[PDB]
């Protein structure tokens, strides 16, 4: 059961993500490295105009060598220590051994004052069974 939830993070892996600015679907950021890795604080560069963007479309790419019932997100943006926003998303059913491609749609302080302040505090789950917690400091060029 929390061994259950250790089989998944053993399985898991993030390959590749990107985000859109939906209207135009242009590429703001993207990267290869798995940023869903709990133990580390990551950090990620993106153009301060993604916060203009009212809509923003990301495509996560993972593999998974276990089966998942009810895979979804909880993320929470945090500035200075404070929520600000929470996210839910999800996937749903996992192929055991599959690489999945996942499209989703994130809709609606200057760039200077969030810089650095923010983090994203993002929770994986197997339905109500939290396989991990990560966390991405955000940087706004
Ligand atoms: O912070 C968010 O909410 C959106 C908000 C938007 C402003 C534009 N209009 C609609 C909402 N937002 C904000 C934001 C933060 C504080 C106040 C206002 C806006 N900063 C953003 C930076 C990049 C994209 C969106 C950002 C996203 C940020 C990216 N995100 C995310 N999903 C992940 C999945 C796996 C691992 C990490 C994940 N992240 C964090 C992340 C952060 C930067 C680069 C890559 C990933 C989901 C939540």
Same mark, same amino acid.
């Given at each position: 059961?929390?061994?259950? *939830?250790?089989?998944?993070?053993?399985?898991?892996?993030?390959?590749?993500?990107?985000?859109?600015? *939906?209207?135009?679907?242009?590429?703001?950021?993207?990267?290869?490295?798995?940023?869903?890795?709990?133990?580390?604080?990551?950090? *990620?560069?993106?153009?301060?105009?993604?916060?203009?963007?009212?809509?923003?479309?990301?495509?996560?790419?993972?593999?998974?060598?276990?089966?998942?019932?009810?895979?979804?997100?909880?993320?929470?943006?945090?500035?200075?220590?404070?929520?600000?926003?929470?996210?839910?998303?999800?996937?749903?059913?996992?192929?055991?051994?599959?690489?999945?491609?996942?499209?989703?749609?994130?809709?609606?302080?200057?760039?200077?004052?969030?810089?650095?302040?923010?983090?994203?505090?993002?929770?994986?789950?197997?339905?109500?069974?939290?396989?991990?917690?990560?966390?991405?400091?955000?940087?706004?060029?």
């Amino acid at each position: 059961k929390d061994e259950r *939830a250790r089989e998944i993070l053993r399985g898991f892996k993030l390959n590749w993500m990107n985000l859109r600015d *939906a209207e135009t679907g242009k590429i703001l950021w993207q990267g290869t490295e798995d940023l869903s890795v709990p133990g580390v604080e990551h950090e *990620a560069r993106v153009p301060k105009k993604i916060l203009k963007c009212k809509a923003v479309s990301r495509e996560l790419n993972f593999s998974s060598t276990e089966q998942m019932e009810k895979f979804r997100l909880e993320q929470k943006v945090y500035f200075k220590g404070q929520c600000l926003e929470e996210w839910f998303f999800e996937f749903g059913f996992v192929i055991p051994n599959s690489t999945n491609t996942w499209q989703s749609l994130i809709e609606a302080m200057p760039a200077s004052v969030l810089t650095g302040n923010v983090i994203i505090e993002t929770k994986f789950f197997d339905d109500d069974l939290l396989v991990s917690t990560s966390r991405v400091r955000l940087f706004y060029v």
